[PDB]
Amino acid sequence: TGLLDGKRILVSGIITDSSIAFHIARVAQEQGAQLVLTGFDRLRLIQRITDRLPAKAPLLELDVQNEEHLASLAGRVTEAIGAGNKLDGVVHSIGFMPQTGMGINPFFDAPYADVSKGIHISAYSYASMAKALLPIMNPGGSIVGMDFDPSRAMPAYNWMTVAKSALESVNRFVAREAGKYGVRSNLVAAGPIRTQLLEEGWDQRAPIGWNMKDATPVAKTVCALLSDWLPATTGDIIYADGGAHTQLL
Amino acid sequence: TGLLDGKRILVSGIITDSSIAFHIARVAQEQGAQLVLTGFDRLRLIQRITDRLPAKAPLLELDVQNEEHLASLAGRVTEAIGAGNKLDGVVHSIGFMPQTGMGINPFFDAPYADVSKGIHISAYSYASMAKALLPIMNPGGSIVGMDFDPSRAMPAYNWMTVAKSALESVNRFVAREAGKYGVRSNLVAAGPIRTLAMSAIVGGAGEEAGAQIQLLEEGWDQRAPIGWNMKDATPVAKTVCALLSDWLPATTGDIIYADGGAHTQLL
Amino acid sequence: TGLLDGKRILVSGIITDSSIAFHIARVAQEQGAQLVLTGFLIQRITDRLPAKAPLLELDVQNEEHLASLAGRVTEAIGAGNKLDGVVHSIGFMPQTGMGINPFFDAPYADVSKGIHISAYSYASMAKALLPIMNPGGSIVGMDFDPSRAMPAYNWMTVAKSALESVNRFVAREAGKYGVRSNLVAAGPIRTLAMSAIVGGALGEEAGAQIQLLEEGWDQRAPIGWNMKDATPVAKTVCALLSDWLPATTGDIIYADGGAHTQLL
Amino acid sequence: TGLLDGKRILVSGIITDSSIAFHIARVAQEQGAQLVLTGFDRLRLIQRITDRLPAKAPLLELDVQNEEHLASLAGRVTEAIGAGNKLDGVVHSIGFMPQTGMGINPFFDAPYADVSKGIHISAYSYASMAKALLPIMNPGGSIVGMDFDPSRAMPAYNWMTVAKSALESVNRFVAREAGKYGVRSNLVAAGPIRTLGALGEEAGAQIQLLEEGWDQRAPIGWNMKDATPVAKTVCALLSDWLPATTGDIIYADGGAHTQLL
Numbered sequence A: 001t002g003l004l005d006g007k008r009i010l011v012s013g014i015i016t017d018s019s020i021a022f023h024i025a026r027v028a029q030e031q032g033a034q035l036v037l038t039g040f041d042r043l044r045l046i047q048r049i050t051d052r053l054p055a056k057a058p059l060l061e062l063d064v065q066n067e068e069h070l071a072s073l074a075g076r077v078t079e080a081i082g083a084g085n086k087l088d089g090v091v092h093s094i095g096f097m098p099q100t101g102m103g104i105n106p107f108f109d110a111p112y113a114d115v116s117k118g119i120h121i122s123a124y125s126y127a128s129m130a131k132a133l134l135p136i137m138n139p140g141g142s143i144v145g146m147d148f149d150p151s152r153a154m155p156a157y158n159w160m161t162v163a164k165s166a167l168e169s170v171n172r173f174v175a176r177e178a179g180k181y182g183v184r185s186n187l188v189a190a191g192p193i194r195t196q197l198l199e200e201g202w203d204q205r206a207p208i209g210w211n212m213k214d215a216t217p218v219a220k221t222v223c224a225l226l227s228d229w230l231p232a233t234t235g236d237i238i239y240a241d242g243g244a245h246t247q248l249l
Numbered sequence B: 001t002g003l004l005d006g007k008r009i010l011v012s013g014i015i016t017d018s019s020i021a022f023h024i025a026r027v028a029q030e031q032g033a034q035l036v037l038t039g040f041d042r043l044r045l046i047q048r049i050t051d052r053l054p055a056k057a058p059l060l061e062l063d064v065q066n067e068e069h070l071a072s073l074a075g076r077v078t079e080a081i082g083a084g085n086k087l088d089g090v091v092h093s094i095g096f097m098p099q100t101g102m103g104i105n106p107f108f109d110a111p112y113a114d115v116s117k118g119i120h121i122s123a124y125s126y127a128s129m130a131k132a133l134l135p136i137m138n139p140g141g142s143i144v145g146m147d148f149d150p151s152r153a154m155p156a157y158n159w160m161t162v163a164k165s166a167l168e169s170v171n172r173f174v175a176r177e178a179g180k181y182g183v184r185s186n187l188v189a190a191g192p193i194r195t196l197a198m199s200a201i202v203g204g205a206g207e208e209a210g211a212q213i214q215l216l217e218e219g220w221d222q223r224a225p226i227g228w229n230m231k232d233a234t235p236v237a238k239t240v241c242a243l244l245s246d247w248l249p250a251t252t253g254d255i256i257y258a259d260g261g262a263h264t265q266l267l
Numbered sequence C: 001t002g003l004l005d006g007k008r009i010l011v012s013g014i015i016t017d018s019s020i021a022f023h024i025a026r027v028a029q030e031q032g033a034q035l036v037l038t039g040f041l042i043q044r045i046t047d048r049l050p051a052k053a054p055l056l057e058l059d060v061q062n063e064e065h066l067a068s069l070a071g072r073v074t075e076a077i078g079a080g081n082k083l084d085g086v087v088h089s090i091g092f093m094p095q096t097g098m099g100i101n102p103f104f105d106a107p108y109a110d111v112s113k114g115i116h117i118s119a120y121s122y123a124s125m126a127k128a129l130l131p132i133m134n135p136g137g138s139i140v141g142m143d144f145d146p147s148r149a150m151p152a153y154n155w156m157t158v159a160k161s162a163l164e165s166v167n168r169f170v171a172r173e174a175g176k177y178g179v180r181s182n183l184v185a186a187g188p189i190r191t192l193a194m195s196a197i198v199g200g201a202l203g204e205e206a207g208a209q210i211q212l213l214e215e216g217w218d219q220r221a222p223i224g225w226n227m228k229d230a231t232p233v234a235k236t237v238c239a240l241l242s243d244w245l246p247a248t249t250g251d252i253i254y255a256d257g258g259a260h261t262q263l264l
Numbered sequence D: 001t002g003l004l005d006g007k008r009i010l011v012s013g014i015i016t017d018s019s020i021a022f023h024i025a026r027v028a029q030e031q032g033a034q035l036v037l038t039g040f041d042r043l044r045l046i047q048r049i050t051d052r053l054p055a056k057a058p059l060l061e062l063d064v065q066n067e068e069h070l071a072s073l074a075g076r077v078t079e080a081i082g083a084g085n086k087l088d089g090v091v092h093s094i095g096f097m098p099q100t101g102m103g104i105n106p107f108f109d110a111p112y113a114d115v116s117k118g119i120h121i122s123a124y125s126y127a128s129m130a131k132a133l134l135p136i137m138n139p140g141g142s143i144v145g146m147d148f149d150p151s152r153a154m155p156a157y158n159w160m161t162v163a164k165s166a167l168e169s170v171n172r173f174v175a176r177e178a179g180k181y182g183v184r185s186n187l188v189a190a191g192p193i194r195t196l197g198a199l200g201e202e203a204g205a206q207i208q209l210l211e212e213g214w215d216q217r218a219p220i221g222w223n224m225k226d227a228t229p230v231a232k233t234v235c236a237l238l239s240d241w242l243p244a245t246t247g248d249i250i251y252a253d254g255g256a257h258t259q260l261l
């Protein structure tokens, strides 16, 4: 008798057992969901990580930069869940920015080819995934993506912050399309998770604190959006950040 | 096996069976919550309405402008739920603005005594309720208030919009205090719902105020990617129950929009 | 050949020569404006401005002062003349609502007084003065970014959230007269009151909390922030009073060194 | 005695005399600024347009997708304004999105190559221009870019709206770098401007309703034919009168974004 009992949910973005997607998948299975997982490049490695989950789930390859992977995705999901069955949820937990665009590298030294790759994977793909999967989603369905509050600039995050600002915009347009299918589209803006000064300021600002080593409160928030309990929320952002973004000091 | 099984929750703001609080109370009871209800002024009338809920719940009087009611509230709640027991949730579903501060009356013609009364009830009382109830709340607890997105000005709502802007600010300060108890504080920003006063304004009780409200409501369902039904409070009640649950444990001082996604779209 | 040459502007809120309104008035006069001042002992401070200006009494909690204001201004500027600008630089919150006092311990009578003066009066002033304002005119109020909660500011932060909402409604009314209404959100300024807190008037704990809040502003601001200098704020107000932001109304301009745009 | 007397300002983005940049250049010259103009591809056509400005100004070629044009830009500007002189202002008034990403085409049918080109020109180039020009900018200087409020989704604008969301984020990072030079960076978010039945009946009606809603929402109204209030706002940011504003957005939209109805 779980929160997601009988729901068929696709979860992308598992690479390690510290991945936010790994925790989303674990909580969803604990809550009765039947999962379909997608992984990128290191599929044998990802399959071994998926063996750590409480229940067995099919693993499909999905490189969001590969248009053939996207064109075949719905058919491959249908084969995994069975003909006549549709998805109730989709989790986009994919992000990438080359070292030139995120870290110590000066903001101005990131070449556009690197930034474009990062934007393709971190923002445009949220629209690609919705385009591929909306034709196989049930009404009352839910699409959830992962965000990192980009409303204010900050050190090091640089072009990944720019990619998240683009993602938030993409999410609002995806909600317009998803609405035609009776499907919601939302992002969960998480605080920093270990998957230093800027990061420690989070626990200080958060009225309920913030534990960077614990992805479970973020996974629970994603599951709340996948459930039938936020039925009037779409094109929106839910902050699972300890309330840090609501406080200056 | 409900979403709020075994939770003790205080729900304020029931006046009619169209009240958002009535629907919050109904959904919470359907989901296994044990309620304590608070009502203002028309207690015999409220008791007749609360009899329509799926389960019996104690009804306590609470006028948020009454210091004595606030000073005795925690003790009265403890008597209702039993000594040694504490609340897991609190719902503030209280709002008021005199006629001078809403509708057709010009924005500039609202006297400050009327505006102040509206702000006391609609915004300051969210802090009063939290002050009175945090000492009797369990860790992991949740305080939820009702909001109407005041980020942009709109016709007729006038000083009620101003009161909601103040409420959003109060919520962020309440979260700082509630955090000390391991309690979350958040607001649910709902789209327009046909409750007692909303139906009267739409019916013109001035022509202009109702016509502007009519265009505002029509636009809401148009802008909402999933549509918006003003006659249905259940999606709003479900959203409040999600915040009262253990499923949004890292959200505080925040606003969740249960508005069909209308605020995310220009047209 | 100043930015505000020939403009007739009302400036409220001068109490000391450290008042933001004192600097706004000074810069406006330097830029060719003809002022009318309102105060609520102030004449000796207003005499320190570069040019002579009539001083009118205005207690924003006094309905009679508000009812007579337009008539008194017309008498000061001469029959047939109207105002081009209005500056609201008024704010108040009792000690129970801001400072060391717990957020929960502020009685509503104190909060309501603070909201009356700091937020509602922006609407009162616009109601009184719009009938004597020229098209292309400008109303400007002072704000302190209340988007996120912070220590000590407490109910003054709540009053500013209310003021931002009031400004958006005032813009609707002012638009009917071809008048703009905007707020300038300033970073913290070392006014007579603020310098005392730094010195230790609030005590060790809150004095350190406020110092972190202040050091953080200059750190976050890409161009830095000088709390001892009100001139960048006065210049921003004058930009809004000018003809150079003709399509901005119901809005907030941040004169805060860009601090509100940065997390760290 | 003008608002920008003696200031040396670079203005990019003139293509026609309806371009917002044409109006920014005109107002800045009326206010005493000495300009350097940059144009893309159709330079002869651009020269004919810039002949219509009140004063003569050097025109430099700048394709923001061309790394060689960006690498040589500072040197070429220095040659135009004279050695030992620096810029006081920079105006980025550049935008592009292919027809697959903006207009009638479904949001989902825009290929990434088209979206990426649009993002390169409309958002990333704001950072490229700042990188090239900050070494030749004076303290107290100002960089201004053009925005269209992307806080809420809307019909047709689609991936251009996404590019503007990216641009607003880029501006906040550019402000961090510009601050090291004592230079401000800000965007002006304009209401819709009629620059240079084409969309059909359905799309044409939705775009007209979207565009007309601005004048209705704006407390002071909005004139879609007139770029001058937008040009004046840009010049206010280029002036010394907003010295404490950076990484920010000034709305020159009649106040439409502050009203729901």
Ligand SMILES: NC(=O)c1ccc[n+]([C@@H]2O[C@H](COP(=O)([O-])OP(=O)(O)OC[C@H]3O[C@@H](n4cnc5c(N)ncnc54)[C@H](O)[C@@H]3O)[C@@H](O)[C@H]2O)c1
Residues within 6 Å of the ligand: A012, A013, A014, A015, A016, A018, A019, A020, A021, A039, A040, A062, A063, A064, A065, A092, A093, A094, A095, A096, A121, A146, A147, A148, A189, A190, A191, A192, A193, A194, A195
């Ligand atoms: N870690 C944090 O502090 C934090 C904070 C807020 C939000 N987020 C977001 O959460 C999401 C998950 O990140 P994470 O922290 O779990 O990191 P992660 O490294 O564990 O996950 C990122 C995933 O993206 C996948 N990916 C990269 N390129 C891909 C491609 N071409 N096709 C498909 N998938 C591809 C990777 O294989 C990986 O599984 C991201 O969107 C991230 O930005 C993370």
Ligand SMILES: NC(=O)c1ccc[n+]([C@@H]2O[C@H](COP(=O)([O-])OP(=O)(O)OC[C@H]3O[C@@H](n4cnc5c(N)ncnc54)[C@H](O)[C@@H]3O)[C@@H](O)[C@H]2O)c1
Residues within 6 Å of the ligand: B012, B013, B014, B015, B016, B018, B019, B020, B021, B039, B040, B062, B063, B064, B065, B092, B093, B094, B095, B096, B121, B146, B147, B148, B189, B190, B191, B192, B193, B194, B195, B196, B197, B198
């Ligand atoms: N109806 C809408 O369109 C709408 C939209 C968004 C949010 N909301 C908010 O939802 C909440 C509930 O409103 P509703 O629409 O159900 O209307 P309602 O009239 O049914 O409920 C308002 C409640 O406030 C109570 N109240 C007033 N003065 C009080 C006092 N002094 N002490 C205690 N309680 C007092 C009333 O007795 C009533 O129970 C309010 O905060 C309202 O602003 C309503």
Ligand SMILES: NC(=O)c1ccc[n+]([C@@H]2O[C@H](COP(=O)([O-])OP(=O)(O)OC[C@H]3O[C@@H](n4cnc5c(N)ncnc54)[C@H](O)[C@@H]3O)[C@@H](O)[C@H]2O)c1
Residues within 6 Å of the ligand: C012, C013, C014, C015, C016, C018, C019, C020, C021, C039, C040, C058, C059, C060, C061, C088, C089, C090, C091, C092, C117, C142, C143, C144, C185, C186, C187, C188, C189, C190, C191, C194
């Ligand atoms: N750090 C700061 O000082 C700071 C930061 C941002 C914004 N602001 C705002 O700037 C404005 C000016 O404040 P300041 O810092 O110059 O302080 P101040 O004390 O010099 O000015 C406040 C003024 O309000 C006046 N006032 C109070 N009650 C009044 C009443 N009933 N009627 C009329 N006037 C009344 C006082 O007489 C005084 O002139 C306020 O709105 C304030 O909130 C200040």
Ligand SMILES: NC(=O)c1ccc[n+]([C@@H]2O[C@H](COP(=O)([O-])OP(=O)(O)OC[C@H]3O[C@@H](n4cnc5c(N)ncnc54)[C@H](O)[C@@H]3O)[C@@H](O)[C@H]2O)c1
Residues within 6 Å of the ligand: D012, D013, D014, D015, D016, D018, D019, D020, D021, D039, D040, D062, D063, D064, D065, D092, D093, D094, D095, D096, D121, D146, D147, D148, D189, D190, D191, D192, D193, D194, D195
């Ligand atoms: N027109 C409106 O309704 C509106 C509204 C808000 C903001 N804006 C913005 O204002 C700016 C100017 O747009 P406009 O309306 O004047 O249109 P426009 O077509 O006249 O100007 C766009 C300019 O971008 C230039 N450009 C395109 N590709 C380029 C490249 N590779 N290198 C260099 N420059 C390149 C073009 O040559 C042209 O001069 C843009 O940023 C636009 O998004 C326009």
Ligand SMILES: Cc1cc(CNC(=O)c2cc(CSc3nc(C)cc(C)n3)on2)ccn1
Residues within 6 Å of the ligand: A094, A095, A096, A097, A098, A099, A102, A103, A147, A148, A160, A195
């Ligand atoms: C090859 C290489 C690349 C990098 C830079 N970043 C990533 O690879 C990278 C990892 C991720 C996961 S997405 C993400 N998103 C946020 C908001 C924070 C974090 C830590 N990861 O994205 N990009 C550094 C060193 N070596």
Ligand SMILES: Cc1cc(CNC(=O)c2cc(CSc3nc(C)cc(C)n3)on2)ccn1
Residues within 6 Å of the ligand: B094, B095, B096, B097, B098, B099, B148, B160, B197, B198, B200, B201, B205
């Ligand atoms: C004669 C008369 C008096 C009033 C006074 N206001 C209320 O009763 C009142 C009721 C409520 C419920 S709270 C609320 N909140 C929003 C956002 C909208 C509405 C209509 N009500 O607020 N004010 C109104 C109409 N006609």
Ligand SMILES: Cc1cc(CNC(=O)c2cc(CSc3nc(C)cc(C)n3)on2)ccn1
Residues within 6 Å of the ligand: C090, C091, C092, C093, C094, C095, C096, C098, C099, C144, C156, C191, C193, C194
């Ligand atoms: C020592 C002490 C005294 C008070 C009484 N209020 C003021 O002095 C007062 C002055 C003002 C001017 S408005 C203002 N606004 C901001 C945002 C900051 C400051 C310092 N003053 O308002 N209230 C309150 C707290 N602590």
Ligand SMILES: Cc1cc(CNC(=O)c2cc(CSc3nc(C)cc(C)n3)on2)ccn1
Residues within 6 Å of the ligand: D094, D095, D096, D097, D098, D099, D100, D102, D103, D147, D148, D160
């Ligand atoms: C028929 C058609 C053609 C295109 C090709 N792009 C442009 O003409 C073009 C011109 C511009 C200038 S930037 C701009 N920015 C905004 C916010 C609005 C407009 C109309 N142009 O950008 N792309 C696109 C859409 N529909």
